[PDB]
Amino acid sequence: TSRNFSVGREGLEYVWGNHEPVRVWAQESAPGDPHGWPHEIIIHYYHRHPVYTVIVLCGVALAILVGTASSAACIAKARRDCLTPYALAPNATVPTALAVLCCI
């Protein structure tokens, strides 16, 4: 018959019958490439510590990109706060380059 066993970096030992014990250790031979492409990098690190890469690498990088939305809000605030002064000065002049977009 056959039997499956898990071995990690610390190692495993098996004794079969009256034989001497045998020790084996596992290496970081995961599929993918650490030096290749982002999809190859992620495949490699998802087999070496799947929990770490999804959570403290890829989840935060996603939440990091959402934080750029707050940056656009500041632009939108600095856009409307500067464009809310619209008409309060009679007998004045405006730049020609901006007179086409100020009306709308």
């Binding site: 970096r9 190692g11 084996v24 970081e28 030096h35 990088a61 750029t68 940056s71 605030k77 600095a78």
Partner: protein, 439 residues
């Protein structure tokens, strides 16, 4: 002189360091743990084995009475039975047809073969670690045994070593262990005198030849129902036999950290756990001044193919120029990459190829030749072999476990987000203070 370094407690894995005195040539030293023993303090509670029930020759009183006495024998039971009329092959054995009391006795001893098949109950206390170390500094190798506590000066001919305290407290033994024929078990056994029928420790003595035995085997003496002389009794099973059927697996198969369990004395050998601080005082006759060691003028590091593996999966060549010949040492100054050699012969011009082991996808360590540093830069591919028969020679650090390409991608994304937020904040402040300036 003094050198304080921490060594991982892994037998057979050399630890290399460089002692750099401010006026002398760098000196190589290699500290390797050859063997370790973790022996606790033990105290015997009792011995146990299979008991032997002895039924003596019964006592018979023909036209009188008998009374039960007291004895010191283990699990001593006694009963008087009247209205008896026993027979043997010759016929009747009394001259009264009734009122012919009989005395039944029972106790237990140690079986004839308990001198081999027996178990010893032991209580264990604070376990103390001792290691055998091989230390090579320069041209001399030294072997010594030291206690890892932090005070005892480990044996050192023309040297001095102090190891300890161990960074973790570990013992494979629970407070109570039993030993039977060389096998060790973590078993909660009853105290001396607290015997229970049908369980381990139901017969207890200090020694096998001891004359005071305590037992509790639940002996019941029954009234004889037949006419021939007979002592009927019933009893519980042997607790020792029940335990031998339910002993479980020994400590030689369940001990953590790859400990080998041995008896006489009880000890765990060659365990791999924790880190050992060592302080060594090098003799001053082992140091040579820089005026005698070769002084190379330049050195460059070229890295060949490398993999992060448990073996020496990397290679590199050093190109140097020394002003004369000599026997300089080599050393890698990273915690994630270790060299195979420690010293080398250098000449006026030449090259030396060195092999290393790393756990990092990128090989950006610093190598010294004659004490002169050069930087090695390359990237190591993942190994092809999944399983090997060696332990890993270096540890895995989060910083040197992420590739430089992945660090560049992550830093680019995080920095892009930070720069976007900074641009937004600067635009907010600038286009708000424009309101202050305009009016």
């Amino acid at each position: 002189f003094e050198h304080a370094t921490t060594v991982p407690n892994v037998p057979g894995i050399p630890y290399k360091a460089l002692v750099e005195r401010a006026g002398y040539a760098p000196l190589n030293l290699e500290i390797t743990v050859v063997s370790s023993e973790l022996t606790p303090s033990t105290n015997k509670e009792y011995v146990t084995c299979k008991f032997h029930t002895v039924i003596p020759s019964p006592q018979v009183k023909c036209c009188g009475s008998l009374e039960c006495k007291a004895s010191s024998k283990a699990d001593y039971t006694c009963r008087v039975f009247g209205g008896v009329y026993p027979f043997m092959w010759g016929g009747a054995q009394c001259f009264c047809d009734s009122e012919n009391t009989q005395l039944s006795e029972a106790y237990v001893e140690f079986a004839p073969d308990c001198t081999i098949d027996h178990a010893v109950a032991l209580k264990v206390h604070t376990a103390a670690l001792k290691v055998g170390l091989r230390i090579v500094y320069g041209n001399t190798t030294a072997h010594l045994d030291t206690f890892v506590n932090g005070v005892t000066p480990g044996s050192s001919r023309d040297l001095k070593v102090i190891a300890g305290p161990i960074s973790a407290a570990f013992s494979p033994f629970d407070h109570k262990v039993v030993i039977r024929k060389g096998l060790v078990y973590n078993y909660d056994f009853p105290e001396y005198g607290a015997m229970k029928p049908g369980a381990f420790g139901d017969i207890q003595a200090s020694s096998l030849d001891a004359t005071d035995i305590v037992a509790r085997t639940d002996i019941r003496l029954l009234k004889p129902s037949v006419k021939n002389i007979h002592v009927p009794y019933t009893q519980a099973v042997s607790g020792y036999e029940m335990w031998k059927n339910n002993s479980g697996r020994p400590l030689q198969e369940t001990a953590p950290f790859g400990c080998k369990i041995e008896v006489e004395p009880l000890r765990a050998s060659n365990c791999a756990y924790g880190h050992i601080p060592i302080s060594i005082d090098i003799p001053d006759a082992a140091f040579v001044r820089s005026s005698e060691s070769p002084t190379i003028l330049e050195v460059s590091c070229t890295v060949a193919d490398c993999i992060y593996s448990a073996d020496f999966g990397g290679s590199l060549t050093l190109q140097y120029k020394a002003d004369r010949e000599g026997h300089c040492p080599v050393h890698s100054h990273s915690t994630t990459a270790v060299l195979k050699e420690a010293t080398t012969h250098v000449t006026a011009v030449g090259s030396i190829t060195l092999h290393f082991s790393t756990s990092s996808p990128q090989a950006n360590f610093i190598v010294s030749l004659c004490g002169k540093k050069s930087t090695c830069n390359a990237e190591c591919k993942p190994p092809a072999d999944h399983i090997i028969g060696e332990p890993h020679k270096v540890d895995q650090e989060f910083q040197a476990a992420v590739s430089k390409t992945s660090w560049n991608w992550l830093l680019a994304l995080f920095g892009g987000a930070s720069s976007l937020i900074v641009v937004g904040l600067i635009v907010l402040v600038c286009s708000s203070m424009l309101i202050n300036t305009r009016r």
